[PDB]
Amino acid sequence: PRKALLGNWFEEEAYMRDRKRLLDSCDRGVVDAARETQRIIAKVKHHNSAYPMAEPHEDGYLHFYAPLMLQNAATLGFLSLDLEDRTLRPTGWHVACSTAPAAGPALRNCFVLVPAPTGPTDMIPAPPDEQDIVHYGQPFFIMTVPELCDNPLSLLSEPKGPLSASKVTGKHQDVFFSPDGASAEAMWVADFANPDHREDMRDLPIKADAVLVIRHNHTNTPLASSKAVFFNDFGPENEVCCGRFVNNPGTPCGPMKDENYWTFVHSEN
Amino acid sequence: REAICIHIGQAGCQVGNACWELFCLEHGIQPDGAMPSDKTIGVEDDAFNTFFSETGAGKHVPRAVFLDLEPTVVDEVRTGTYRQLFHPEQLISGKEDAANNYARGHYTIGKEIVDLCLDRIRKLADNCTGLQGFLVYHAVGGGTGSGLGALLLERLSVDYGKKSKLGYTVYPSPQVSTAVVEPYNSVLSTHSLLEHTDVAAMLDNEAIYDLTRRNLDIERPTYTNLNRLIGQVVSSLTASLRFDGALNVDLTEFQTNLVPYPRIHFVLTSYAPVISAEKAYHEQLSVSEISNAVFEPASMMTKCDPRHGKYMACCLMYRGDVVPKDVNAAVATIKTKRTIQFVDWSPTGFKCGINYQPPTVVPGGDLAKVQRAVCMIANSTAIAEVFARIDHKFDLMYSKRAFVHWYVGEGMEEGEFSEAREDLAALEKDYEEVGAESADMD
Amino acid sequence: REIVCVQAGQCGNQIGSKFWEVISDEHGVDPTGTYQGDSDLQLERINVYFDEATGGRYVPRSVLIDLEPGTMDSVRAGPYGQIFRPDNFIFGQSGAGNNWAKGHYTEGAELIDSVLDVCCKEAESCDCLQGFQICHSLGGGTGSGMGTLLISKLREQYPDRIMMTFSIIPSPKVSDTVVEPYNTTLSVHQLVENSDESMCIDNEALYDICFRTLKLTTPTFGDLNHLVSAVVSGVTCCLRFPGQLNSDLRKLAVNLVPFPRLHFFMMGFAPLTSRGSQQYRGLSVPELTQQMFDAKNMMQAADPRHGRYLTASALFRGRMSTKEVDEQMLNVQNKNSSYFIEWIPNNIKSSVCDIPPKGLKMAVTFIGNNTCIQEMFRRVGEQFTLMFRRKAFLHWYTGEGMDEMEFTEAESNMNDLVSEYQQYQDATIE
Amino acid sequence: REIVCVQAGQCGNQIGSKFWEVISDEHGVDPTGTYQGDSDLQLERINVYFDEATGGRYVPRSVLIDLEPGTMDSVRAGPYGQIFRPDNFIFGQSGAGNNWAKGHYTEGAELIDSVLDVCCKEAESCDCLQGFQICHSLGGGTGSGMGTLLISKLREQYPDRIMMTFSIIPSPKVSDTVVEPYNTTLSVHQLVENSDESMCIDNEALYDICFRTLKLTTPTFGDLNHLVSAVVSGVTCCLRFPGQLNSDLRKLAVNLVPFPRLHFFMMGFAPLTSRGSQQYRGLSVPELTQQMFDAKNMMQAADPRHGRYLTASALFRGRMSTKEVDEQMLNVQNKNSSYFIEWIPNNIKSSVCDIPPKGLKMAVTFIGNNTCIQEMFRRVGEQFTLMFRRKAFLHWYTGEGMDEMEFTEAESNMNDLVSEYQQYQDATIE
Amino acid sequence: FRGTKTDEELANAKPPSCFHENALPELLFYHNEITNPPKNLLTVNELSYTNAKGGEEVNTLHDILHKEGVSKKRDKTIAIRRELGFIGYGAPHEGSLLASKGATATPLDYTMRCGTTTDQNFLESTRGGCYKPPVIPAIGRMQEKQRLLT
Amino acid sequence: MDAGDARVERLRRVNRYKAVQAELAREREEAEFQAMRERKISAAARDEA
């Protein structure tokens, strides 16, 4: 509008039009609120693009080099990453990760499995015809799809100490994504669901739908997802950490509750 | 950071209900102690800490004690809607009242209950890390408010020492009256309050009735209306500790700016945008208009006229959309006025505070919604008129020992009346001497 | 030649945030702290205000002190806040309460040792140390008391360096605090003994600059702090860029101070003009000089027309001819000869620097030593004597522990400073 | 050059578990025992702490001993517990009862033979044996009594090797045990004759390190055991990696122990800094040396400023110039000359190692032989004399079998060592 | 004193806090075009003494006093930009051209299989917008390789 | 340490939110004004026809 022209209307009209021209034309980096809100919207739109997941194999086993999802037994959410919650650390770049519900496969929750070259010095090697099948006790890597970004990322963890803690609760180990890979801190080993038959099923092929526990090979601490909730650009998401969850704190070594169990999700037939 | 509120007797508990209703609604704590999560902002805020502490489960509980000798009003709080908000130990109640006798509260009955109150206050002060004062609400017209309030302020003053104590006190109105023995209790209360209080805020119910009839359009007001206005005033004064602003004001700043000599600590209070919803949308409410409003005697919450005295200090709190340049222009225009006068030894008479949070609107309230407000507390020699009229009424009854046998039976020496009357006479002469100007040479 | 900055109190931390934004912008430092400039001229003197941390980054050599962390949480939350070193924020647990005695004697001695430890680590880290620079208000509580305490300690530990202060002083028209005369009197008493050069700014003068020159309808403290950050970053410009006639804080001091007590100066910055008018007038040395001497553009309430100039200094930034600068300073001295003290043959020093502030073709900052500054101190002394005769509010100061003799000493020292200015104003050759 | 480790008692087993985690991490050994490293420099000295088992595996050269299996069952059940050789876990069936005499005379002789059998098998298995390393607390019961018993047997059987101990000593502010003075006095009496070098740590000093330097809000024993594991693995780093100036445990002992009875040392580690601040300051030799001599970073309650250094040692890790190390050690000795013993012309030995700890550009570990350690022993002797004069708990010890003459001998022997420090502290060149 | 019932009423009880927007510094000082200010980073000595025989141009006095541009020497800025490109803040992305001898970051099996099956059309479709994904270098492997050297 | 970081993060998010809401409010006011003008012009033309 124009209003009545009493007082300082001329200079303020000029000031307002110059401010409008500055805001519309200049970029100003992160200072501008509208531009950063728009870029966060574009961020969310990009991260949730659909992905053509692979169908289950005929033999019914777990295979390498195939897109997959990770779902937790307690939260019933899928593992996801946020590329922009990143801070530089003395050991490298750390990218935060969480677990969230989703409507299907996406660029933020589809992973592949890549085997590691060294076993635990008492391994019985698999036959040449089972090279692509994943066996219990065999280390492997978890990696992001090549379409997400230029440099592939990997799931890593670090030992707990004064300078290392979990994201929310701060009482367990930290799990994060990093361009670091092919290192001793990126190896994971799966085990059997039933505790008494755990060492009878060692070095055997894994069925496509088995419930299983993932352990950090270099620290021997299982992967888990608690019920702690934090907010980000996508909404409310849960926490991901390495630790053993038990019913009685007085006996830390014992039965493990449902939030140490995971599963692999394929595409519907 | 933190402050503890002490509510004594009937008026103090009923004003406490309105205050905690307001503090809950402004911070957002539900009546059962919970606080809904926000999805637009990622994390919550510490602002409740001044008035609330959270349990490990996230329930909120308030930093207050309610003290009374009769159970009925506290039992009404215990059975009402906010039952789950308060901790049951905080609501302390005796069996029987002080029956409008200051002597019964101070000597006979309050001596048994006072140690439980001190144990609760100690347990609160242990759960703090930056306590910065006590706020006290009581009426000096009744027996337990005067007697137990004085005894408890004496004990707090010995145990905690330098910590500040700011009082909101309901004094006997100048012509509306409720009980015959009000002058004796008010004089004996004021004697103890002189030594053991840092700032005393004065209220009169007749002024708040005048304010609710003239500005709002209410023909038949009741105590809930007055208590909602008092709650708004206390929220305005304590907002400077709890929300972001351009010029913050800590509770110690009040004592530094308003009290020139240790006995001259009684202050007048006023509030500007008392307006109804229907009137509010026909008029602008600029900074200069509300600044002009706070100095008219129709805006005051105590029945005294400041044109018969001199100002010594003023503290102005602005909350809402205000810009410092407008505050400076308004204060310079006020300073130009000839009907506003300051003692010649106080040239820099003003302290300013500016906070961004506008005043909150309460669902059943009668005030309109407004973008800005200003509240003033000021020290002026005009307050001497209130004591002189209470002292004259005391002299009229005491000349014939009208009711003294009750006080002597409940444990008091007759000498205590004469001592208190001489102390109030000295306070009157202090206000006479401090207000004398030596501006004329020779 | 390295400067160490000290930021004290709410006003000091707020002005400092904008100053460090302006300095980081001029040297092309990203708000993440990474150097992203595009010419070696920006990098070659970055050491003057920044220390170098590993992998490109720079951190600013400043100490932030305050008694309540609210302001520091606001600056850490600001857009450039991340650049500041976390260990450089020092805070207590209770406010100054607007009382000089608390800030100097009771809560001061507990933190002062930790502040001196940080200041000593920063001074001893430099390969060659230049003077300290301090910004604070004299009307506040922690600014006056703790600032003057730290100034006294640094003057004991480094007596051969320079001590420079920028200070905010109460306006003549409206007070923000009732007890301003005590804090101002004791702070001026401490500064006149300890300081080497002190600059004074009135908030009322910045409001008059905004309303009259820039015609802003609703100015805010962000604008006042940008004007202050602009002039403060301008006085030091010749230390950190090349130029045809270099200058240094000691060279300004040697040309500006005739006698050691006469170290109080007026400030001005020339290129100010509203956005509607700016398209109608180009920058030139006559225009800058004309605005430079207009009392409308001076940042203190006293006006030069009631006094005389003992000395003045002008620092020009930009590529310009020396003839126009020299002839303008000669023309102003010759045409207004009655306003310059006659027993000094030339009162103006000039300096020229090649690199102007971003977005301006040329700029000048003006520093003036004028006897009209005596009028503000006289006003403060009158209000102090009115308050002191009745010992107003004195129990706060005496309860903290101060002897009444400090008040009489501070009053006597300010009265002698006013007398000394008045006698040199009316001096003659005879 | 291989070391044999012994872990005794709850404190010893807990510190040992974290130590073996840190060492397995530094050499890239999986908790299954598989090598997963990425450079031959990691593998080429693995023999120093590990023996090789068949088909690739490595086993850690450690003996675990305790009197009640609760802690041992927890560590064997722990995540790295499998790496330990099963035959190396030695435990009894009844506790030490927190009593030194019970731990030394009654339940000790039953297990000591099985412990000596395991220790001799490990020592005689080495191709060339370096010194033994013992971890224990002095305030406990089985740690002090059975640790000193085993030390006495190893000193009789292997008098030509080195005996090194890391020991926990009672805090000056809060006791964890009522009978601490007896156990401490008898243990120090045994070590004064038997030990070659003993390092002492106070838990209160680790709490002050965590709260003041690292600013942890809620520290736990995992943090304290990480600080201890870091320093213990740092002192031996030059034994197992290349460097410009090699060093060894025997060379450290010869350069730090002037006279024979003086063999108690304080320890410190320098690059401690909070996770938020570490991005703001790069490592350099002046910064490490200045923090390294700051008493804020020292792990004992006694402060060097009340004493004088008789000798010292600094072990540096990283690629760095020898000139900066030498000139820093000279500059610190010259500027603080009053705190260094005059008869010795140079009190500090330096050593340089090429390989730093992961994630740090540079690090130094500091060992110091200072006379202020005498203040701790005097305080322990005062508390002992207070308890002994009243026979406060003596019937337990006499019922175990001790003659009262042992308590007077132990008191006399300790009183002598404190006096020896007093005489060497106040000695003169003459 | 009947209490509140729904969360919406409790939310609308509070009015939102007022917000004062500080004036931008460009609105107070800038004199040229507000959307495109000229860059002045030239000294008189650099712009006066040139190498005329070598080939670089000479400047008149009016040209010296009225020229816009940036000084030619930018060696240290180039070095800093390259270093931050290796670290990860560099826009030109000087890194990622080659890898060190012993600082691998991806197993070779990922490159041979499940790395050569990228769909360029799908990637171009998902990149289309005002947001582009960052490129994060493998600084950890690099500094790990530097750490284990003598 | 966590409390201060939480405070700082809340302040930055709330400040961004306020700025965006102010800008949207101004834009909506301008759009409503323009729509009113257009509909009134159309009404006048229709009545004349």
Ligand SMILES: Nc1nc2c(ncn2[C@@H]2O[C@H](COP(=O)(O)OP(=O)(O)OP(=O)(O)O)[C@@H](O)[C@H]2O)c(=O)[nH]1
């Ligand atoms: N403004 C206001 N005044 C009140 C309120 N309740 C009581 N009063 C006034 O305070 C005085 C009565 O004091 P009370 O609080 O009833 O006295 P008490 O503390 O109960 O003392 P006892 O009667 O001995 O129990 C009268 O002047 C009342 O008008 C209230 O809720 N608001």
Ligand SMILES: Nc1nc2c(ncn2[C@@H]2O[C@H](COP(=O)(O)OP(=O)(O)O)[C@@H](O)[C@H]2O)c(=O)[nH]1
């Ligand atoms: N120019 C300017 N003045 C300020 C600023 N902040 C506060 N002031 C003034 O400084 C005085 C208040 O002092 P303050 O800094 O609060 O004192 P402290 O409490 O000791 O830190 C008043 O006159 C304010 O007007 C600011 O950002 N700029």
Ligand SMILES: Nc1nc2c(ncn2[C@@H]2O[C@H](COP(=O)(O)OP(=O)(O)O)[C@@H](O)[C@H]2O)c(=O)[nH]1
């Ligand atoms: N730093 C540290 N001290 C410990 C630890 N465990 C116990 N202590 C301390 O050692 C002392 C107890 O000795 P303890 O090991 O129980 O003796 P024991 O019963 O003979 O094994 C106390 O001072 C404890 O605080 C630990 O893991 N770390």
Ligand SMILES: [Mg+2]
């Ligand atoms: Mg009652």
